């Protein structure tokens, strides 16, 4: 399976029981749902400008 790219644009805050997760807002580069901004969680160090590959685009994580 080839996922769908999306570009990080805003760090929200640190989540998780141990501080290993990070809530993020991403923009869909291209695919089916291009141009949409959603909210997603990400494990690991991140920064604005990074790219992530999503298997879904349709889970819309919960606000912290």
């Amino acid at each position: 399976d080839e996922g769908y790219p999306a570009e990080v644009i805003e760090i929200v805050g640190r989540t998780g029981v141990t501080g290993g997760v990070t809530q993020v807002k991403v923009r869909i580069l291209e695919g089916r749902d291009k141009g949409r901004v959603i909210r997603r969680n990400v494990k690991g160090p991140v920064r604005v400008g990074d790219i992530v590959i999503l298997r879904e685009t349709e889970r819309e994580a919960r606000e912290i």
């Binding site: 997760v21 969680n41 494990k43 990074d50 790219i51 992530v52 298997r55």
Partner: protein, 213 residues
């Protein structure tokens, strides 16, 4: 024995170990492109200068990172391939020369058997061994095992660790050597063979994560 034109090797061009180029190498994953350092160098050795700074690892050449992974003892406080690998006096810990040579031989074998650039081979292997996981999150009092995505830098760390561990596995208390094992692992992961520890764990991790979505 090593011939003399190999024991006393003198480089003339800027080339990894004086032998292999980078301009013909091409990455394709837009997520990992900006973290795979392909700078033209001769000696991949940074002497621990880029550790303090948070994102200082994007300035280290892939080959130096792989050498540093290979510079290990095995598996302490966890089991790999079913068993602890504790060497503790016959380990290459703080010995970068041996890891350098191991990687060099592995690259030679890869070139011999593939007729391509071992750096392109390693790049495709990373691309195919990088996992796109699950953790534990509390939405207030209650905790759930959730599925979260991963970042490129952690992906790279994962892939390199897994390749090195695959080699250390296949070279454990057997007639095979560490260089041959590393070459086997790299070719397997690059052509997507389930014979590879790294591709195996990538598939397993994605499999589990898919469950707890």
């Amino acid at each position: 024995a090593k011939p003399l034109t190999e024991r006393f090797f003198i480089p003339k061009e800027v080339k990894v170990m004086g032998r292999w180029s980078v301009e013909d190498v091409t990455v394709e994953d837009p997520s990992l492109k900006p973290y795979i350092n392909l700078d033209a160098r001769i000696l991949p050795h940074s002497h621990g200068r880029y550790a303090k700074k948070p994102f200082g690892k994007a300035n280290v050449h892939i080959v130096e990172r792989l050498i540093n992974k290979v510079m290990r003892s095995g598996a302490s406080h966890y089991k790999a391939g079913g068993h602890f690998m504790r060497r503790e006096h016959r380990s290459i810990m703080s010995k970068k020369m041996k890891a350098y040579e191991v990687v060099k031989e592995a690259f030679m074998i890869i070139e011999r058997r593939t007729k391509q650039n071992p750096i392109q081979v390693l790049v495709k292997a990373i691309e195919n061994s990088a996992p796109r996981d699950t953790t534990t999150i509390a939405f207030g009092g209650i905790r759930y095992h959730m599925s979260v995505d991963v970042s490129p830098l952690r992906r790279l760390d994962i892939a390199l660790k897994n390749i090195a561990l695959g080699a250390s596995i296949k070279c454990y208390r057997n007639k095979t050597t560490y260089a041959q094992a590393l070459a086997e692992e790299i070719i397997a992961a690059a052509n997507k063979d389930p014979k590879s520890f790294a591709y195996s764990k990538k598939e397993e991790i994605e499999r589990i994560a898919q469950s707890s979505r």
